[PDB]
GROMACS .gro file of C-alpha atoms in nm:
model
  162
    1UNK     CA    1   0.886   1.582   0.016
    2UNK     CA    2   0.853   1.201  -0.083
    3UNK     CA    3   0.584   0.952   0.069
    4UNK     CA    4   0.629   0.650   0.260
    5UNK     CA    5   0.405   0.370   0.448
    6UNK     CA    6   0.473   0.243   0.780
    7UNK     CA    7   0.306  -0.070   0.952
    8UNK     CA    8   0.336  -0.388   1.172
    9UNK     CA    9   0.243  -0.707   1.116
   10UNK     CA   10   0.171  -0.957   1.411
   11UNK     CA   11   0.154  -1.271   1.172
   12UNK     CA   12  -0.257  -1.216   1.053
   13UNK     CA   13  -0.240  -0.975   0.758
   14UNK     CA   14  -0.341  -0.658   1.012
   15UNK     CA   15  -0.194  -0.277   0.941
   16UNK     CA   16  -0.311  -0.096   1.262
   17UNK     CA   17  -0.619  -0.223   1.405
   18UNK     CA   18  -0.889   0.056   1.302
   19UNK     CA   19  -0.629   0.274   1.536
   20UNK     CA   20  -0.408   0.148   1.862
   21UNK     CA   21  -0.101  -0.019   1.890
   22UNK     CA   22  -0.116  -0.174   2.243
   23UNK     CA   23   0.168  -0.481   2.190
   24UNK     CA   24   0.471  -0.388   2.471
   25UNK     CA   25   0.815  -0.600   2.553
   26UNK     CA   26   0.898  -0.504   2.203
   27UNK     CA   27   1.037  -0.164   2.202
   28UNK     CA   28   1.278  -0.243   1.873
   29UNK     CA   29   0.994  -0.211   1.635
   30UNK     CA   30   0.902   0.148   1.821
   31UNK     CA   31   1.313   0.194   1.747
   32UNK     CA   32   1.262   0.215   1.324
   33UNK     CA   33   0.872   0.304   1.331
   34UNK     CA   34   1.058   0.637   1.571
   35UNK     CA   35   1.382   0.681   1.377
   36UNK     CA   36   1.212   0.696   1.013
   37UNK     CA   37   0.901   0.871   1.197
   38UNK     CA   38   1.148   1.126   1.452
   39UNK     CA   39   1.076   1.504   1.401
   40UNK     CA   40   0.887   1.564   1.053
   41UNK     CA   41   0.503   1.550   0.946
   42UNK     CA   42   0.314   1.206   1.019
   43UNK     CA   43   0.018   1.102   0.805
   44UNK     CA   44  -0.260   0.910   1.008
   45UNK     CA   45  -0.633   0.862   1.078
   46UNK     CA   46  -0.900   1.000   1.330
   47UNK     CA   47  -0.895   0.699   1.564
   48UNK     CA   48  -0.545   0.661   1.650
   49UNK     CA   49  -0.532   1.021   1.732
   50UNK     CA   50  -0.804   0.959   2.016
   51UNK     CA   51  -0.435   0.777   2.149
   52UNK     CA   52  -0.256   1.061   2.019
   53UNK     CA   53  -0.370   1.336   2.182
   54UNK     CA   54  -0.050   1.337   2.507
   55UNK     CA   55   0.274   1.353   2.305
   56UNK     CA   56   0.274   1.351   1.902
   57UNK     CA   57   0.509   1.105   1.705
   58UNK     CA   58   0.659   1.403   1.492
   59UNK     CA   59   0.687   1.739   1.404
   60UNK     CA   60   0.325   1.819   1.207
   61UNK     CA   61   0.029   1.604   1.320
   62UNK     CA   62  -0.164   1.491   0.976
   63UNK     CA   63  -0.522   1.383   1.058
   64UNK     CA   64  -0.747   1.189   0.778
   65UNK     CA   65  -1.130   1.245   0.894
   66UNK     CA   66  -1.467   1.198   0.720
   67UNK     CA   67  -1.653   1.465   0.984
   68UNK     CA   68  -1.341   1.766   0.927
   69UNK     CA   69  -1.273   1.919   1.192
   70UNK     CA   70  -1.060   2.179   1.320
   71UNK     CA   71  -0.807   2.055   1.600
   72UNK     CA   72  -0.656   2.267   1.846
   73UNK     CA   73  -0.300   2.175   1.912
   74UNK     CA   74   0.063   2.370   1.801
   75UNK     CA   75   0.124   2.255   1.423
   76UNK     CA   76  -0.180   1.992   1.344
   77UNK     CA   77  -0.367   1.966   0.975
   78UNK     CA   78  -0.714   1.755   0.890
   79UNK     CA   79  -0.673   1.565   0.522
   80UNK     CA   80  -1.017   1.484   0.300
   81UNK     CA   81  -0.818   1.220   0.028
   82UNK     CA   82  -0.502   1.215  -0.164
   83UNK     CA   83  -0.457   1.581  -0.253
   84UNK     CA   84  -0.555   1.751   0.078
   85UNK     CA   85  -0.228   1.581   0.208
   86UNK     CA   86  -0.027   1.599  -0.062
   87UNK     CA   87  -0.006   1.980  -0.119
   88UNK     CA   88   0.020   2.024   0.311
   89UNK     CA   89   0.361   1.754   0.228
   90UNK     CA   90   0.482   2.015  -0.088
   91UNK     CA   91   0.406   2.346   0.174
   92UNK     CA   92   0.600   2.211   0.467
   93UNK     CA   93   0.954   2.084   0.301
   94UNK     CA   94   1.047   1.812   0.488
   95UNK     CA   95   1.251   1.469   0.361
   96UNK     CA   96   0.926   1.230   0.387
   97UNK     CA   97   0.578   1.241   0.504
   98UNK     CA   98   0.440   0.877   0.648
   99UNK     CA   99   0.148   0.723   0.606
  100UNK     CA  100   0.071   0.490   0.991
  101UNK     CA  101  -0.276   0.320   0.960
  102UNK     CA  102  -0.536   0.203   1.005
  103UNK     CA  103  -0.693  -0.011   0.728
  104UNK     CA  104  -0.921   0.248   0.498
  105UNK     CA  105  -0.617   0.517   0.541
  106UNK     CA  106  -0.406   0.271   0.400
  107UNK     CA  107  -0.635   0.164   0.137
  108UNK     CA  108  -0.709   0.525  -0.118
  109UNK     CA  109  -0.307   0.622  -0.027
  110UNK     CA  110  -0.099   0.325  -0.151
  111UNK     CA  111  -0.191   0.445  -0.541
  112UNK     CA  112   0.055   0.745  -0.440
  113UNK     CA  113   0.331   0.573  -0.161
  114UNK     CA  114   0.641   0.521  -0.398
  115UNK     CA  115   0.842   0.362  -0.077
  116UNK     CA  116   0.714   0.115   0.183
  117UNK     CA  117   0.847   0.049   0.546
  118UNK     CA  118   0.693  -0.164   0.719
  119UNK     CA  119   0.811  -0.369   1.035
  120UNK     CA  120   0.710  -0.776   1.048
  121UNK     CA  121   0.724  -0.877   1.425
  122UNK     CA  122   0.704  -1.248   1.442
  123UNK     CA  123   0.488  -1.504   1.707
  124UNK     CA  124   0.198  -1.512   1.909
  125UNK     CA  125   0.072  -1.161   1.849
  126UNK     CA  126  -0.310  -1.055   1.749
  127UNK     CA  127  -0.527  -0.891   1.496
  128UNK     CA  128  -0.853  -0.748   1.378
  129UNK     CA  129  -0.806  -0.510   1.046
  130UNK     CA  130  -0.649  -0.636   0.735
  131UNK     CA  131  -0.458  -0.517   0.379
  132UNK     CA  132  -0.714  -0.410   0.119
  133UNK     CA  133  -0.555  -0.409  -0.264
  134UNK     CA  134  -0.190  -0.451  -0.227
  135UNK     CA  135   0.044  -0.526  -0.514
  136UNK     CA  136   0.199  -0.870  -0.470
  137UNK     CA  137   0.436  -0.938  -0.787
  138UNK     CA  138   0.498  -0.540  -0.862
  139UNK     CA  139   0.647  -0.419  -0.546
  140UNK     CA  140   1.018  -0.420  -0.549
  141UNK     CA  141   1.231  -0.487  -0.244
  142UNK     CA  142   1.542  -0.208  -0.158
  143UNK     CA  143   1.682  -0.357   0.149
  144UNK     CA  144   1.553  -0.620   0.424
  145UNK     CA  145   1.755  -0.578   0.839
  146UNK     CA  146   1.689  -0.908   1.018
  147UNK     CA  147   1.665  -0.866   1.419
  148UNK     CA  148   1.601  -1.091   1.750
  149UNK     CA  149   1.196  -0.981   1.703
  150UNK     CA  150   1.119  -0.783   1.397
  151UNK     CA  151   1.174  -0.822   1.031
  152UNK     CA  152   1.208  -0.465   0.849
  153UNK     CA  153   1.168  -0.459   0.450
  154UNK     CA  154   1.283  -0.106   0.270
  155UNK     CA  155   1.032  -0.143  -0.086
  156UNK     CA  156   1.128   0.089  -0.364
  157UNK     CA  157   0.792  -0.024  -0.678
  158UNK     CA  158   0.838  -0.228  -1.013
  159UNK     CA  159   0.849   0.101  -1.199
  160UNK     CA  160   0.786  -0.032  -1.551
  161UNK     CA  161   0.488   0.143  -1.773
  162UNK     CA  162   0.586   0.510  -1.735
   0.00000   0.00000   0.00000
């Protein structure tokens, strides 16, 4: 039951742009965004699902929406802010839950993501949404695995003040 964040970068600062992904040829990025995010509960917002509506990335379909509604699929869940999907994360028992995107998702959840995973693909590649508050001294790196065209960084938090 831990929490984790999981992006791309395409050079210009942008963590899902308000919600599609639509950047093929690179299918290695899509190989650790789908082995950390494989068959447990995935943490997104209301316009990628409008993409993600044909197959699901994982095993319980978390849905962040300011009109909440009630979705009919197999095992899917609306979230209102941090608590709504934190006690749905305790009640289903999983390893990790992951937050994907895009920009005001990311912004209210990284005060509670004690991890970060998120995948830097470098060269020509574009952008439209951008990081809000991030912590750029006090997030401590875990483990970086350089590849042909992505860069992933493993982030564990500074810690200190507890």
């Amino acid at each position: 039951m831990e929490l984790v964040s999981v992006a791309a970068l395409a050079e210009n600062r942008v963590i899902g742009r308000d919600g599609e992904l639509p950047w093929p040829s690179i299918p290695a990025d899509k190989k650790q965004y789908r082995s950390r995010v494989a068959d447990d509960p995935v943490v997104l917002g209301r316009t990628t699902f409008e993409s993600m509506r044909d197959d699901l990335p994982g095993s319980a379909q978390i849905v962040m929406s300011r009109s909440e509604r009630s979705f009919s699929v197999d095992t899917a869940h609306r979230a209102a802010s941090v608590e709504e999907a934190v006690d749905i994360a305790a009640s289903l028992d999983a390893e990790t839950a992951y937050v994907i995107g895009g920009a005001a998702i990311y912004a209210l959840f990284q005060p509670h993501l004690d991890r970060m995973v998120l995948s830097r693909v470098p060269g020509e590649y574009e952008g439209d949404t951008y990081y809000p508050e991030w912590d750029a001294a006090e997030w401590e790196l875990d483990a970086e695995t350089d590849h042909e065209g992505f860069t992933l960084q493993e982030w564990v938090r500074s810690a200190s003040s507890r």
